[PDB]
Design a protein around this nucleic acid. Structure first.
Ligand SMILES: [Zn+2]
Ligand SMILES: [Zn+2]
Ligand SMILES: [Zn+2]
Ligand SMILES: [Zn+2]
Lengths: 74, 79
DNA sequence: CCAGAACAAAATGTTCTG
DNA sequence: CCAGAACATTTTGTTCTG
């Protein structure tokens, strides 16, 4: 397709198994490797789009996983 | 009290007219000196505590405004 | 073309100085 | 005590290298 499946910015290729942009790729790797235990400040349903992808690591990461991102993709 | 009224961290003094920590103080000064065209990803009531104050500058700024913060606070107090 | 590194920028937080 | 500044860290994002 065309746009990132996590944040709807334009995607840069298939990363960790899913079409995504560069920032989401590294965010996802950092999230998993850092074990940050992110906590949403709203209702676990934050809108994650181009401007607001910084707004909630908990929801962004959740949206990553739901899109099927995984580190040992291939 | 001595906890920040914006985020409930340890307040460090009365800054721009309200008990706040140093981080909220400078966050507000910066929001006020420049642009604060932020956008909330939830429902404009995000919970602002020590860790999550980073998540939503839109709501963090709102809770500063709502607490009465203003730059001329200290000068107005001397009047 | 992609993962991870390395570099860079944005955003946040702390100590210094008037 | 508290303002702004200066210094410092964190967080996110882009380009480079394997
Ligand atoms: Zn993305
Ligand atoms: Zn959220
Ligand atoms: Zn605070
Ligand atoms: Zn918010």
């Amino acid at each position: 397709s065309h746009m990132c499946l996590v944040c709807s910015d334009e995607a840069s290729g298939c990363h960790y198994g899913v079409l995504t942009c560069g920032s989401c790729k590294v965010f996802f790797k950092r999230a998993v490797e850092g074990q940050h235990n992110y906590l949403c400040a709203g209702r676990n349903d934050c809108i994650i789009d181009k401007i607001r992808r910084k707004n909630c690591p908990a929801c962004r990461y959740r949206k990553c996983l739901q899109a099927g991102m995984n580190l040992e993709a291939r």
